[PDB]
């Protein structure tokens, strides 16, 4: 029964979610970062429906 730990912001850019800002959800890392938060297109936000998080890729495979 580990003590556990509080959660953190989403954008790997050390910044919590912002409805003003748009995100792309880690297909496998269930997380959201401002488009540029990870260095992505703006459109990558809209024309997207299979985008994956960058932290996810680390978990994807070795």
Swiss-Prot record:
Effect upon mutating residue 32 to E/F: Abolishes binding to histone H3K4me3
Subcellular location: Cytoplasm; Nucleus
Tissue and organ expression note: Ubiquitously expressed, with highest levels in testis. Present in kidney, liver and brain. In the brain, highest levels are found in motor cortex (at protein level).
Processing after translation: Phosphorylation enhances DNA-binding. Highly susceptible to proteolysis.
Cysteine pairings via disulfide bonds: none
Effect of residue 30 to K: Strongly reduces binding to histone H3K4me3
Similarity-based family: Belongs to the PBTF family.
Subunit and interaction comment: Interacts with MAZ. Interacts with KEAP1. Component of the NURF-1 ISWI chromatin remodeling complex (also called the nucleosome-remodeling factor (NURF) complex) at least composed of SMARCA1 (isoform 2), BPTF, RBBP4 and RBBP7. Within the complex interacts with isoform 2 of SMARCA1. Component of the BPFT-SMARCA1 complex at least composed of SMARCA1 (isoform 1), BPFT, RBBP4 and RBBP7; the complex is catalytically inactive and does not remodel chromatin. Within the complex interacts with isoform 1 of SMARCA1.
Disorder association: Neurodevelopmental disorder with dysmorphic facies and distal limb anomalies: An autosomal dominant neurodevelopmental disorder characterized by variable degrees of developmental delay, intellectual disability, speech delay, postnatal microcephaly, dysmorphic features, and mild abnormalities of the hands and feet.
Protein name: Nucleosome-remodeling factor subunit BPTF
Gene: BPTF
Included range, full protein: 2865 to 2921 of 3046
């Amino acid at each position: 029964g580990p003590l556990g730990s509080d959660t953190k912001l989403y954008c790997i850019c050390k910044t919590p979610y912002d409805e003003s800002k748009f995100y792309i959800g880690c297909d496998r890392c269930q997380n959201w970062y401002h488009g540029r938060c990870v260095g992505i297109l703006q459109s990558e936000a809209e024309l997207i429906d299979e985008y994956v998080c960058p932290q996810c890729q680390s978990t994807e495979d070795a």
